[PDB]
Design an enzyme around this catalytic site. Sequence first.
Site, PDB file in Angstrom:
ATOM      1  N   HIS A   1      34.885  82.339   5.448  1.00  0.00           N
ATOM      2  CA  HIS A   1      34.218  81.108   6.093  1.00  0.00           C
ATOM      3  C   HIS A   1      34.735  80.940   7.648  1.00  0.00           C
ATOM      4  O   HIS A   1      34.049  80.265   8.460  1.00  0.00           O
ATOM      5  CB  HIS A   1      34.656  79.843   5.359  1.00  0.00           C
TER       6      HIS A   1
ATOM      7  N   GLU B   1      35.955  86.015  -0.409  1.00  0.00           N
ATOM      8  CA  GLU B   1      36.442  85.089   0.744  1.00  0.00           C
ATOM      9  C   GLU B   1      37.261  85.576   1.509  1.00  0.00           C
ATOM     10  O   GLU B   1      38.160  85.014   2.270  1.00  0.00           O
ATOM     11  CB  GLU B   1      36.908  83.671   0.061  1.00  0.00           C
TER      12      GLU B   1
ATOM     13  N   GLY C   1      43.198  73.041   8.084  1.00  0.00           N
ATOM     14  CA  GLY C   1      43.686  73.723   9.194  1.00  0.00           C
ATOM     15  C   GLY C   1      44.639  74.753   8.662  1.00  0.00           C
ATOM     16  O   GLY C   1      44.982  75.548   9.500  1.00  0.00           O
TER      17      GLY C   1
ATOM     18  N   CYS D   1      43.702  76.946   6.149  1.00  0.00           N
ATOM     19  CA  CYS D   1      43.235  78.393   5.911  1.00  0.00           C
ATOM     20  C   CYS D   1      43.454  79.784   6.843  1.00  0.00           C
ATOM     21  O   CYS D   1      43.580  79.501   7.877  1.00  0.00           O
ATOM     22  CB  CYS D   1      41.557  78.260   5.824  1.00  0.00           C
TER      23      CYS D   1
HETATM   24  C1  LIG Z   1      36.196  72.665   7.464  1.00  0.00           C
HETATM   25  C2  LIG Z   1      37.428  73.073   7.875  1.00  0.00           C
HETATM   26  O1  LIG Z   1      37.872  74.124   7.130  1.00  0.00           O
HETATM   27  C3  LIG Z   1      39.270  74.394   7.027  1.00  0.00           C
HETATM   28  O2  LIG Z   1      40.040  73.829   7.602  1.00  0.00           O
HETATM   29  C4  LIG Z   1      39.425  75.710   6.485  1.00  0.00           C
HETATM   30  C5  LIG Z   1      40.637  75.355   5.519  1.00  0.00           C
HETATM   31  C6  LIG Z   1      40.549  74.585   4.156  1.00  0.00           C
HETATM   32  C7  LIG Z   1      41.736  73.874   3.536  1.00  0.00           C
HETATM   33  C8  LIG Z   1      41.483  73.014   2.344  1.00  0.00           C
HETATM   34  C9  LIG Z   1      41.132  71.670   2.885  1.00  0.00           C
HETATM   35  C10 LIG Z   1      41.326  70.758   1.764  1.00  0.00           C
HETATM   36  N1  LIG Z   1      42.647  71.105   1.199  1.00  0.00           N
HETATM   37  C11 LIG Z   1      42.663  72.611   1.592  1.00  0.00           C
HETATM   38  O3  LIG Z   1      43.478  73.322   1.237  1.00  0.00           O
HETATM   39  N2  LIG Z   1      39.389  75.051   3.473  1.00  0.00           N
HETATM   40  C12 LIG Z   1      38.149  73.976   3.096  1.00  0.00           C
HETATM   41  O4  LIG Z   1      37.918  73.219   3.512  1.00  0.00           O
HETATM   42  C13 LIG Z   1      37.215  75.055   2.479  1.00  0.00           C
HETATM   43  C14 LIG Z   1      36.360  73.989   1.343  1.00  0.00           C
HETATM   44  C15 LIG Z   1      37.137  73.773   0.300  1.00  0.00           C
HETATM   45  O5  LIG Z   1      38.488  73.763   0.506  1.00  0.00           O
HETATM   46  C16 LIG Z   1      36.429  72.687  -0.615  1.00  0.00           C
HETATM   47  N3  LIG Z   1      37.366  72.377  -1.814  1.00  0.00           N
HETATM   48  C17 LIG Z   1      36.998  73.061  -2.834  1.00  0.00           C
HETATM   49  O6  LIG Z   1      35.802  73.439  -3.154  1.00  0.00           O
HETATM   50  C18 LIG Z   1      37.636  72.992  -4.164  1.00  0.00           C
HETATM   51  C19 LIG Z   1      37.273  73.212  -5.656  1.00  0.00           C
HETATM   52  C20 LIG Z   1      38.398  73.172  -6.548  1.00  0.00           C
HETATM   53  C21 LIG Z   1      38.377  73.363  -7.703  1.00  0.00           C
HETATM   54  O7  LIG Z   1      39.323  72.740  -5.694  1.00  0.00           O
HETATM   55  N4  LIG Z   1      38.805  72.842  -4.331  1.00  0.00           N
HETATM   56  C22 LIG Z   1      36.204  71.234  -0.168  1.00  0.00           C
HETATM   57  C23 LIG Z   1      35.769  70.343  -1.171  1.00  0.00           C
HETATM   58  C24 LIG Z   1      37.481  70.479   0.564  1.00  0.00           C
HETATM   59  C25 LIG Z   1      36.187  75.586   3.620  1.00  0.00           C
HETATM   60  C26 LIG Z   1      34.918  76.371   3.014  1.00  0.00           C
HETATM   61  C27 LIG Z   1      33.605  75.851   3.113  1.00  0.00           C
HETATM   62  C28 LIG Z   1      32.582  76.618   2.626  1.00  0.00           C
HETATM   63  C29 LIG Z   1      32.703  77.752   1.805  1.00  0.00           C
HETATM   64  F1  LIG Z   1      31.850  78.545   1.536  1.00  0.00           F
HETATM   65  C30 LIG Z   1      34.090  78.307   1.616  1.00  0.00           C
HETATM   66  C31 LIG Z   1      35.275  77.588   2.211  1.00  0.00           C
END
Ligand SMILES: CCOC(=O)CC[C@H](C[C@@H]1CCNC1=O)NC(=O)[C@@H](CC(=O)[C@@H](NC(=O)c1cc(C)on1)C(C)C)Cc1ccc(F)cc1
Length: 181
Positions: free
Chosen positions: A40, A71, A145, A147
């Site tokens: 992503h 991913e 932040g 990831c």
């Molecule tokens: C946009 C900023 O991006 C970042 O900061 C990247 C890192 C964050 C870290 C998260 C941030 C939060 N707590 C965490 O650890 N990652 C994401 O936000 C991802 C989304 C989730 O984590 C989703 N979670 C699940 O689906 C989910 C499912 C189950 C089950 O557990 N989590 C969202 C709902 C948060 C980003 C993503 C969006 C579209 C995709 F194609 C694939 C991935």
Amino acid sequence: GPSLDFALSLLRRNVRQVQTDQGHFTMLGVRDRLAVLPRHSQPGKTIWIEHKLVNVLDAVELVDEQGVNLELTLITLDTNEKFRDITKFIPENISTASDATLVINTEHMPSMFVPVGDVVQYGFLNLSGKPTGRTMMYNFPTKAGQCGGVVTSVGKIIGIHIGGNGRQGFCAGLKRSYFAS
Ligand SMILES: CCOC(=O)CC[C@H](C[C@@H]1CCNC1=O)NC(=O)[C@@H](CC(=O)[C@@H](NC(=O)c1cc(C)on1)C(C)C)Cc1ccc(F)cc1
């Protein structure tokens, strides 16, 4: 324990701060000019690494043998730098851990270590609507932040942080064969 020291050495030699149009990520340098990012992050033809613009020679989004999204995106960087080969520390099969450390290094979250504890098999994950396989889970409140963060146990590099729901975190599991030539 010994997990933490391994994690520190990996940080200096193989973990880098990057920025794409999608924001700030941690990047694991794997060997020579080969590195890995969360899919992503959508790296383009140019990427910011440690305050320098760097040309990207090739990028490939990883899938399993059935075609399921993992991913992870592998990239080859147009750089002088040659990463120390850390593939020997990546297990042949997806590996859980009892005392894992997550290593994060971005401009906004520089050089930090988070003891996430047990990393358990999870498998299929629906990640904001995107199906993903071969994930593992930790009961730690990871955040935006983080990831790209590298999940490590003693002498093993086991995952890349990709998501979470506020209470738990999830990584894409690493296998050595992902990085085969
Ligand atoms: C946009 C900023 O991006 C970042 O900061 C990247 C890192 C964050 C870290 C998260 C941030 C939060 N707590 C965490 O650890 N990652 C994401 O936000 C991802 C989304 C989730 O984590 C989703 N979670 C699940 O689906 C989910 C499912 C189950 C089950 O557990 N989590 C969202 C709902 C948060 C980003 C993503 C969006 C579209 C995709 F194609 C694939 C991935």
